[PDB]
């Protein structure tokens, strides 16, 4: 899909809040409209493109311009490569790589100022989902934890070529700097356990044998480190059940929990020596 409308591109550039000294990381450069516009509007434009022929097209289009030296092209898959420093990110992203890449943008260091993202309507609405919405998912709670998100403007697909399947949308994202003091591996593991079945209660979510296996591993690690003598008649599931009733989340379901409830649950589980890693 190649974005061809100039005025929607201008709206993205304007509401991205560019500066003349900013470094811009661009994903999905397309045919070279917004690339050369960023080159006119930024100090350095880092365009990431896997296909070498698209790189050749972009390099030909920026050739002969005074802004040719300000463009740096990263050839390769953006998911595996190490992203350099940038002040502002802009991206025309495919659906298939949409979700982990955002997490990469959540885990990129050092912190940037802003990122403007093109998404599908399904992904964009799941991204900004409030608790109680049917589109609430792990992406919603994780991105509302680590960052602040705003759904900006609903984009028609006649601006692209070829026009995609579902409608298009624009998302403005910025990480919270400093981030909240929550271990993101721990948070993501706990949320991964709780969203195995989202309409099922946390008690029955923690009755699962795989959950018992992983928590047995982590509790054995904790007892090995801190020299805690495990009783023979110990039941990890009984422990989890009585802590979950001690917290008040036994009868609550995972689709109706906000960030604060998961924070309380993780605080209780970590205070009881249960870790998810």
């Amino acid at each position: 899909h190649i974005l061809k409308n100039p005025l929607i591109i201008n709206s993205i550039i304007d509401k991205a809040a560019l500066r003349p000294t900013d470094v811009v990381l661009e994903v999905g450069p397309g045919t070279g409209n917004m690339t050369v516009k960023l080159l006119e509007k930024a100090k350095k434009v880092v365009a990431c493109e896997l296909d070498p022929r698209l790189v050749a097209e972009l390099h030909k289009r920026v050739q002969g311009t005074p802004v040719a030296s300000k463009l740096q092209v990263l050839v390769g898959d953006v998911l595996k490569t190490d992203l350099p420093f940038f002040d502002t990110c802009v991206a025309n992203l495919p659906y298939q790589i949409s979700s982990p890449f955002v997490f990469k943008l959540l885990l990129h260091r050092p912190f940037f100022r802003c990122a403007i993202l093109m998404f599908q309507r399904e992904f964009a609405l799941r991204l900004v989902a409030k608790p109680g919405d049917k589109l609430y998912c792990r992406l919603s709670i994780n991105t509302q934890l680590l960052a602040r998100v705003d759904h900006l403007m609903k984009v028609g697909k006649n601006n692209f070529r070829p026009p995609p399947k579902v409608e298009s949308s624009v998302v403005r994202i910025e990480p919270k700097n400093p981030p909240p003091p929550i271990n993101f591996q721990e948070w993501d593991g706990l949320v991964r356990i709780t969203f195995v079945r989202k309409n099922k209660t946390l008690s029955a979510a923690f009755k699962s044998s795989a959950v018992q296996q992983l928590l047995e591993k982590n509790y054995r690690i904790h007892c090995s480190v801190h020299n805690i003598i495990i009783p023979e008649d110990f039941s990890i599931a009984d422990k989890i059940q009585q802590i979950l009733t001690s917290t008040g989340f036994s009868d609550k379901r995972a689709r109706s929990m906000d960030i604060d409830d998961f924070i309380r649950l993780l605080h209780g589980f970590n205070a009881e020596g249960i870790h998810f890693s």
Partner: protein, 226 residues
């Protein structure tokens, strides 16, 4: 290659009309790729032969390398004292140059040759695809290639265009004097990127019933209606 022995090379240098016309499509081909003026570029000459197109390229200040398979073409090109360099080889096996090498490519009457299977090991489509992929390899990114031909039918055209669009080249072809016969040339230019009542009266006609004659006043507003 065995056409161009000493005899046919001596014929080729001794042909006023052929030299004049090769100069003409050499000039048109050099005009057709938009290389910048006052910038001496680096070009690949394909079907150089005696180097007539190469001589035209050297006349305009550009530097070029010729590629051919006939020894007598390259021998007579040396005998004509050309300025560029020559290489003895076939495009179908691949052009042996690094990526990012040639600022432009000019092929003169050398691309209709690979469209037929002459040996049992040979294959026209795969040889043409290898030729186009090697062109896409050795050309610098953002360059242009002009390829001159006289297609005898559209089978050669469809094979050449499929193998060109399958190797990553973008562009098209332009025909000089398409309606003419003596001046018609093919240049494949590639680069690395009231009606209602009328219908109702017809409906009543197909239903076979009597209808009024169809005249000027068929659909016409009589007067304003209040």
């Amino acid at each position: 290659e065995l056409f161009y022995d000493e005899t046919e090379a001596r014929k080729y240098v001794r042909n006023s009309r052929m030299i004049d016309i090769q100069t003409r499509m050499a000039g048109r081909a050099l005009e057709l790729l938009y290389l910048p003026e006052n910038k001496p570029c680096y070009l690949l000459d394909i079907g150089c032969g005696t180097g007539l197109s190469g001589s035209y390229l050297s006349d305009e200040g550009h530097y070029w390398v010729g590629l051919d398979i006939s020894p007598a073409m390259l021998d007579e090109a040396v005998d004509r004292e050309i300025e560029g360099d020559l290489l003895l080889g076939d495009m179908g096996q691949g052009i042996p140059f690094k990526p990012g090498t040639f600022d432009g490519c000019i092929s003169i009457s050398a691309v209709q040759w690979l469209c037929n299977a002459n040996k049992k090991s040979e294959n026209p489509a795969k040889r043409l695809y290898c030729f186009f992929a090697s062109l896409f390899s050795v050309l610098v990114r953002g360059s242009r290639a002009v390829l001159q031909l006289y297609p005898e039918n559209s089978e050669q055209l469809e094979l050449i265009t499929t193998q060109a669009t399958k190797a990553g080249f973008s562009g098209g072809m332009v025909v000089d004097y398409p309606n003419s016969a003596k001046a018609k040339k093919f240049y494949l230019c590639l680069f690395s990127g009231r009606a209602w009542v009328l219908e109702k009266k017809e409906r009543h006609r197909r239903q076979g019933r009597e209808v009024r004659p169809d005249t000027q006043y068929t659909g016409r507003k009589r007067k304003p209606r209040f």
